[PDB]
Design a protein around this ligand. Structure first.
Ligand code: CLA
Ligand code: CLA
Ligand code: CLA
Ligand code: CLA
Ligand code: CLA
Ligand code: CLA
Ligand code: KC2
Ligand SMILES: CC1=C(C#C/C(C)=C/C=C/C(C)=C/C=C/C=C(C)/C=C/C=C(\C)C#CC2=C(C)C[C@@H](O)CC2(C)C)C(C)(C)C[C@H](O)C1
Ligand SMILES: CC1=C(C#C/C(C)=C/C=C/C(C)=C/C=C/C=C(C)/C=C/C=C(\C)C#CC2=C(C)C[C@@H](O)CC2(C)C)C(C)(C)C[C@H](O)C1
Ligand SMILES: CC1=C(C#C/C(C)=C/C=C/C(C)=C/C=C/C=C(C)/C=C/C=C(C)/C=C/C2=C(C)CCCC2(C)C)C(C)(C)C[C@H](O)C1
Ligand SMILES: CC1=C(C#C/C(C)=C/C=C/C(C)=C/C=C/C=C(C)/C=C/C=C(C)/C=C/C2=C(C)CCCC2(C)C)C(C)(C)C[C@H](O)C1
Lengths: 90, 172, 180
């Protein structure tokens, strides 16, 4: 009804192709599909290892293993970005 | 290809004009983040580390009058704990934070592209008016800072293992 | 074609180095050829270090390792060093350093494999590491296929050396010397 504002740098992201344009990756638009795939596996293994090392949680958990455990969900987003980049030819 | 690493491709974001360019970015971190931000951060890390490495050696060589009572034996990281209890560390933090607030404004100007990164126009004694000497001095600053970053980590880890401190460990 | 009975797969290029056409089960079709080549070259280099290490360990030991390691051992050495590292000994932290440096090298050589798979200028296996320049300088000799032949020998040779000492207490030099 009036112009709806968006932050500067807003671009069009609507896609009907096989994979979205690399712009949907934000700052990761230039990273290669191999680099996301290797980061995906690396984050999955390190995150799973760190998660496993603190499954019986104590009052003294290792903070590096807590922080490293956040790599498991981050790896999901990494392999999605790897599929997007492989299907954009990157 | 890259001058540093022959097998890998040349990093796209990095250019020869920028000081301390070896074409070294195998993981391509320069693509992910704005290069101007990375340049400003690298220079800042270099200067803090340079002060840190010189200070680490200096504290072994000599200590300021009256400091010895407050710091009984602790060196490197250990001194910080005692001076944190006393007022030294807090007063340094306060004045550095005040400097950084203006540094935040400077960082914004560098990110916009208006101002060259890492330059605060601080040349109290003229050393870079030649415009040929300036570039050599800039390369010297980058290389010395990189060495000091590596050195600061190297020294502190030796303190962690033995507690000797940089010069004492070399003697024994 | 090494075996005329089983044909060489078309996907395998004749031009690529080290090609004897021995792919009876045609495993080349299943996987990317460039990645398969890189995996082979990397496997050969790691295996070559492992087998010489087995021979050298018996003949020479670095000073002071004798206390931290059993007098004759192979994989036992790895377990012994790890046992002292887990114990908390400062001195026996060799495994972490080897792991860290090899991992760091692998991390920074990671883009190379993907870049070659995208048709990048570097061929598989060439990291341009020839400081001396003598071995690969100018035209070069048959050393390019020599690495592959010695590496394949090293792979099976490591398998033999490791598998012996699993059923026996004998080491590589000892088992070669006396055979029961
Ligand atoms: C990252 C840098 C860093 C850090 C965190 C510390 C931290 C500390 N130092 Mg060390 N020190 C440093 C650098 C550093 N120092 C440098 C560069 C030197 C000279 C080579 C020294 C020499 C030194 C001695 C001799 C002693 C300490 C001591 C101490 C402790 C008490 C604070 C004090 O009195 O310092 C005082 C430190 C100084 C006055 C030196 C600062 C000089 C630098 C070059 C500041 C330059 C500012 C610059 C000119 C302005 C640039 C502006 C630009 C950004 C626009 C504290 C843990 C004391 C201690 O407990 O020792 C065991 C002590 O006796 N420092
Ligand atoms: C920030 C770190 C720091 C700390 C914790 C101290 C602490 C102390 N100083 Mg000080 N001092 C410092 C930095 C510092 N100094 C610096 C950077 C200078 C200038 C170089 C001085 C110059 C100084 C003088 C001139 C004297 C002290 C003295 C003293 C001590 C008085 C009590 C005593 O020893 O009895 C006290 C513990 C007194 C002392 O006993 O020193 C011999 C004294 O007379 N200080
Ligand atoms: C340019 C920086 C610099 C310099 C000159 C040194 C130099 C030194 N360090 Mg420090 N170090 C550095 C950076 C640096 N390190 C960094 C960035 C790290 C990672 C945090 C370390 C971690 C570190 C540890 C953990 C140890 C050293 C040790 C050593 C010494 C022996 C090195 C050795 O024989 O291993 C090289 C061996 C090889 C087989 C390489 C070939 C030497 C005085 C060791 C020492 O004896 O100090 C007590 C030690 O235990 N350093
Ligand atoms: C996969 C390979 C492998 C593995 C896991 C081990 C592991 C081990 N060795 Mg063995 N070793 C190896 C290869 C290997 N070694 C090789 C290749 C040799 C030389 C022929 C030796 C000779 C050797 C001796 C003499 C001793 C050990 C010992 C040990 C133990 C302590 C670490 C140590 O001092 O090693 C030391 C190993 C070396 C110094 C060999 C380094 C050779 C390098 C890798 C050659 C690099 C060439 C080239 C320039 C590198 C290219 C870089 C490029 C990839 C970028 C540990 C279990 C010690 C022990 O307790 O045994 C009972 C011991 O005394 N090793
Ligand atoms: C390049 C490899 C290398 C070299 C040159 C040395 C050299 C030395 N070692 Mg050995 N050592 C090595 C690798 C090496 N080490 C490895 C890989 C381990 C196991 C991780 C050990 C574990 C070891 C122990 C446990 C001890 C030595 C000790 C020593 C020193 C005295 C020799 C001795 O005990 O008689 C000597 C300088 C002794 C020492 O530190 O003497 C002060 C000692 O007690 N070494
Ligand atoms: C039989 C061993 C052997 C051979 C013939 C080769 C040959 C080659 N390699 Mg490979 N390589 C090997 C082992 C070997 N490599 C191992 C073990 C490693 C890991 C450290 C590597 C890592 C490696 C990299 C990273 C690269 C090469 C490259 C090359 C090529 C050019 C450089 C050159 O001429 O090297 C000549 C090498 C030799 C003649 C090896 C000599 C070893 C000595 C004489 C004998 C072994 C000593 C050993 C320590 C044990 C001694 C006895 C012990 C049992 C007591 C060439 C095809 C480069 C390439 O293809 O691009 C240019 C390249 O980038 N190699
Ligand atoms: C499965 C992986 C495996 C590999 C890749 C492999 C390769 C080689 C090579 C290639 C480099 C050589 C040259 C070689 C030579 C001998 N092997 Mg062999 N070998 C493997 C497995 C086993 C097992 C399970 C045994 C064994 C034996 C022997 C004996 C007999 C000496 C004897 O009769 O005592 C000799 C000479 C037996 C032995 O160890 O007897 C205690 C026996 O148990 N091997 N072996
Ligand atoms: C004049 C002035 C200016 C200024 C300024 C300033 C303050 C400039 C200062 C620059 C400095 C402080 C440079 C210091 C670098 C230190 C290095 C490279 C460390 C090397 C140590 C190594 C390799 C080691 C080690 C060690 C290991 C790790 C463990 C130990 O157990 C043993 C050991 C010790 C061997 C500016 C530019 C602001 C403007 C204007 O012009 C006015
Ligand atoms: C690349 C290159 C460089 C380099 C380098 C390096 C490190 C080159 C190293 C090359 C190496 C280490 C080659 C070793 C191969 C080992 C073999 C074939 C062993 C087979 C064992 C068998 C068959 C057995 C056995 C048996 C016995 C004895 C014991 C029994 O218990 C078991 C069993 C019965 C099975 C340099 C530095 C030159 C620079 C250059 O610019 C580029
Ligand atoms: C904790 C604590 C404190 C503190 C503190 C401080 C000062 C902490 C600072 C820690 C630092 C600076 C660590 C840096 C480590 C550098 C590394 C790992 C790089 C290694 C190089 C590598 C892997 C490869 C290098 C490479 C080689 C070899 C070949 C390839 C090329 C190259 C890249 C050159 C206090 C002060 C609060 C006190 C408190 O009571 C306790
Ligand atoms: C330190 C560590 C460990 C470890 C470990 C290690 C190092 C384990 C290594 C295991 C290996 C290499 C097993 C492979 C065995 C079989 C081989 C090599 C057969 C090759 C020949 C074939 C297939 C045929 C070839 C052929 C011939 C005959 C001629 C015709 C052609 C062809 C058909 C090609 C443990 C496990 C001890 C545990 C410990 O806590 C931690």
């Amino acid at each position: 009804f009036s112009p709806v504002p968006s932050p500067e740098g807003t671009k069009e992201t609507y896609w009907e192709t096989k994979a979205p344009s690399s712009d949907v990756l934000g700052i990761g638009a230039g990273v290669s599909s191999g680099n996301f795939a290797a980061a995906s596996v690396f984050a999955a293994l390190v995150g799973g290892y760190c998660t496993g090392q603190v499954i019986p949680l104590t009052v003294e958990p290792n903070p590096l293993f807590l922080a490293g455990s956040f790599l498991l969900p981050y790896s999901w987003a990494l392999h999605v970005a790897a599929w997007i980049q492989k299907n954009n030819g990157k | 290809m890259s001058e540093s690493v022959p097998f890998l491709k040349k990093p796209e974001a990095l250019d020869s004009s920028m000081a301390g360019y070896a074409g070294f970015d195998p993981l391509g971190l320069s693509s992910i983040a704005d290069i101007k931000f990375l340049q400003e951060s690298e220079i800042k890390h270099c200067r803090i580390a340079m002060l840190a490495a010189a200070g680490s050696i200096a504290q072994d060589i000599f200590t300021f009058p009256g400091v010895s009572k407050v710091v009984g034996t602790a060196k490197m990281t250990g001194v910080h704990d005692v001076l944190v209890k006393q007022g030294a560390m807090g007063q340094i933090l306060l004045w550095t934070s005040f400097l950084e607030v203006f540094g935040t404004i400077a960082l914004l100007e560098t990110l916009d592209g208006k101002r060259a990164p890492g330059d605060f126009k601080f040349d109290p004694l003229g050393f870079s008016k030649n415009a040929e000497t300036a570039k050599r001095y800039q390369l010297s600053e980058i290389k010395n800072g990189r060495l000091a970053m590596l050195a600061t980590g190297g020294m502190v880890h030796g303190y962690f293992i033995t507690g000797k401190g940089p010069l004492e460990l070399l003697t024994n | 074609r090494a075996v005329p009975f089983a044909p060489a797969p078309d996907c395998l290029p004749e031009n690529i180095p080290g090609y004897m056409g021995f792919d009876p089960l045609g495993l080349s079709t299943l996987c990317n050829v460039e990645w398969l080549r890189e995996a082979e070259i990397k496997h050969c280099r790691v295996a070559m270090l492992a087998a010489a290490g087995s021979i050298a360990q018996d003949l020479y030991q670095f000073p002071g390792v004798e206390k931290i390691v059993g007098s004759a051992k192979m994989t036992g050495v790895h377990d012994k060093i790890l046992a002292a590292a887990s114990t908390g000994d400062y001195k026996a932290q060799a495994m972490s350093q080897i792991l860290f440096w090899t991992s760091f090298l692998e991390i920074v050589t990671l883009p190379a494999v993907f870049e070659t798979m995208n048709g990048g200028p570097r061929k598989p296996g060439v990291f341009f590491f020839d400081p001396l320049g003598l071995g690969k300088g100018d035209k070069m000799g048959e050393m390019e296929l020599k690495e592959i032949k010695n590496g394949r020998l090293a792979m099976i040779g490591v398998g033999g050396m490791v598998h012996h000492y699993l059923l026996t207490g004998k080491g590589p030099i000892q088992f070669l010397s006396g055979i029961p």
